[PDB]
Write a protein that binds this ligand. Structure first.
Ligand SMILES: c1cncc([C@H]2CC3CCN2CC3)c1
Ligand SMILES: c1cncc([C@H]2CC3CCN2CC3)c1
Ligand SMILES: c1cncc([C@H]2CC3CCN2CC3)c1
Ligand SMILES: c1cncc([C@H]2CC3CCN2CC3)c1
Lengths: 203, 207, 209, 211, 203
């Protein structure tokens, strides 16, 4: 089986998406913890898992040709991955988990990096019943909507793994598709907007 | 003589130098923690910083060799990047874990591998009660990030965290530290999932 | 047909890369610079340093990067790692920490041989924020230019003297009273040759909550 | 002539590297590393976390047969400098650091024709240390062991030249003054392994310096 | 034009200095800013440009054979560079500028990296009229005086680019060559000693 896997990988190992060969990446966010809210600089720090999924013809294989192998794990540097970027980060994003993706015989890839992000956020009112609200856009930095498209499986941020003893509780968190125009180029870019309303948790 | 033993080790490393575990070729990884120090308990962000040695042990057929065919060499040291290693991860870290020791593993002729990285970890933890008699209790799960229980099974030698190297003058004293294997099931998948749950009860040490 | 389009791109990239030593006095380069100011994160009066987040739009044109779209299936542009190509050494002349890169280091190349590179960056630079809590506010400046190329190898241009503020963080601790980007020419002790820079002048003030 | 010497060094380096290989020490071919510390500064002592930060130079010395050469055979070159990445280096590690060590100096070693290597990285280290009593006459006492992380005493042995830490470069205007600093060899056993491991124990007694 | 430069660089692209082939490095400091003076740890943070110059025969060429090229720019990683090091830094020095050098046809190299350095320094008196005085030595870490010699053009630090609105004003800054011995080796080591007297600037 080891030989089969090796052979498959060898046989497998695409210049990224193009206007003729567009790509749809599905984004989903799991919010694990709001670590810190700095009212002196208006930066908030999030820990979250960013689920990325996409599908490439060039990654399909017949499991029957490879000992019934239906999927495998490989370093994310072994394959192409989307340049999904936070548009209002204030520090470089920190990766908390192993950079390893899962590839299925149907040519779909799933890559779920855990990250810590500092982004621009005014925490004013976090100490009130209404809480504070902040938002950060996630999308390709260099690919327009014509090259890379984004969609979500749902507009509800997954909160099932949120840290129950965090300094902050989540009142709501959504994730929404957006189309933006920027001064630099004619073509529009796509992002998923993460909107979180949150409040200091009482002990 | 000494030149002959070097040649022997070189030939052995050449011959040995695996796509990782699979459902058909599963792997048991043994984890063990040696808790060295609780450096810091931040009640303003609810992060606690631990220093520990994380002992990982696994066994591969593809790393076996007959010692008599290589000058009685029973084991050797090699860079951790020369071999496959488990993607064991803390599930609730708040910053990238920091490695404090050389990334080198010990390989034994039976194919068993021992890898003990030293690490500093910030993880999610409410230190409420740390200043009390009963202390604070926090927990952090360690497991594979991308492998299920059908590819990587985890085991412990014991459920007692090794405290023989715990820093005696730490700001915090350990009341109890346990390491327990956990098997869980999720709706999304049929495969069982495994992790080792590190639970530490600690309080402020009196000077 | 899609496998053909991928092959075409691979062919184009292949031809261009496996075929530029940077600008010279004989073959000088004009780099256009534009700044998009996104946030003034912090102003530290203890050390006289200010931290900004901005997008640094860079454009230049290389004959060596030209291709005929018809010969390549109508590809008019492509994305490529900034490491696969030459990029200008545009540098802040008064930073106090290494610039932090916040965006993927990828450039866009068009068939006419022009490149567009827009790194998002956080920059700490020298700045006395005195008066930032006053009506007139505080003024600060930071020069941007090549570190090693003189005005003879690299010339700088702007498309406008007005910094793009259309993306400035509305709820920042600081608000922008004005922000300009202006071409300048300076001389240094080490070298006779002039160096060219774009001066970023920002007048800012504490935003009333 | 000068070109001749350059060529000679190149030839030598090439003979030693590209065409020689040393897999590290073993039970049959064990290595002895001489360790010495030049303590330069106690930068900070944090009583809230019990961490102390040291700046020091760590003099490492070992000798390999496979690095020996005949100077007469290479234009009388008796030594040379090379990137520490071109040769094997001991995995000498502090056993109680709380953060990754920070390297302050270029990672370049000196190789001598007898096969001896000298490597002296300057480092800043945060390690576990209770600084209670640092404001007393007696001062505070802390210790930290340095040893190979993965080699037992059967593969790597350690020794010092002297038990006296080199204090001739200690920063005279540091916040903290040194009352004594010793470096001592130790043999220890750890639960994971049967084999004993070797360390040099750096023990420092220090005190707040009066202005 | 581009072809000539490419040919030249290819033709050019030395194991470092030796006793039989020593090297003289000229050092010059341009002090731009004293960012911070920390009296709790006795560390001071400097921002400066460190001009390095040296000459290699093996980098010489005839401009006549190369389209009249008299100089070119190249990555500092393409050539040997001197391991000039602050002897009393307390943090890894941080490089603020692109690692690129200028090579001239006579074989002379000029390399001017901007750096931020924390180094050992008691800032006591910095709030007085006479100010505070600190020093830090710069030299090769591993080449003795028999392999690398150092020198300044002048003993006066270039203050022409010093930040006018720094928290600290410069009363004087000098750069002087020194010969020193260390316990580790019999051979002498060469350094250039940066001595700065400074005080808090009145607003
Ligand atoms: C093109 C190339 N590099 C960067 C971009 C930037 C510009 C701007 C920010 C996000 N993205 C599109 C909008 C476009
Ligand atoms: C030459 C080489 N390397 C760096 C430089 C620096 C020094 C000086 C200021 C900015 N820049 C141009 C002149 C020049
Ligand atoms: C064996 C392999 N890798 C690491 C070790 C560790 C365990 C323990 C701490 C330092 N070191 C030797 C003793 C042993
Ligand atoms: C020899 C080899 N490697 C480092 C050194 C150190 C020792 C000491 C400090 C700076 N440098 C020369 C003198 C010498």
């Amino acid at each position: 089986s080891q030989a089969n896997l090796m052979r498959l990988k060898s046989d497998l190992f695409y210049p990224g998406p193009t206007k003729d060969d567009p790509l749809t990446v599905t984004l989903g966010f799991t919010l694990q913890d709001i670590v810190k809210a700095d009212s002196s600089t208006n930066e908030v720090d999030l820990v979250y898992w960013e689920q990325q999924r996409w599908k490439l013809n060039s990654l399909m294989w017949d499991p029957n040709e490879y000992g019934n192998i239906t999927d495998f794990r490989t370093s994310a540097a072994d394959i192409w991955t989307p340049d999904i970027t936070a548009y209002s980060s204030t520090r470089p994003v920190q990766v908390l988990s192993p950079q390893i993706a899962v590839v299925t015989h149907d040519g779909s890839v799933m890559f779920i990096p855990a990250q810590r992000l500092s982004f621009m956020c005014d925490p004013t009112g976090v100490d009130s019943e209404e809480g504070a609200t902040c938002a950060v856009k996630f999308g390709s930095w260099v690919y327009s909507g014509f090259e890379i498209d984004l969609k979500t499986d749902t507009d509800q941020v997954d909160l099932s793994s949120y840290y129950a003893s965090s300094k902050y509780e989540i009142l709501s968190a959504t994730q929404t598709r957006q189309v933006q125009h920027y001064s630099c180029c004619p073509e529009p870019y796509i992002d998923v907007n993460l909107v979180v309303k949150f409040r200091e948790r009482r002990a």
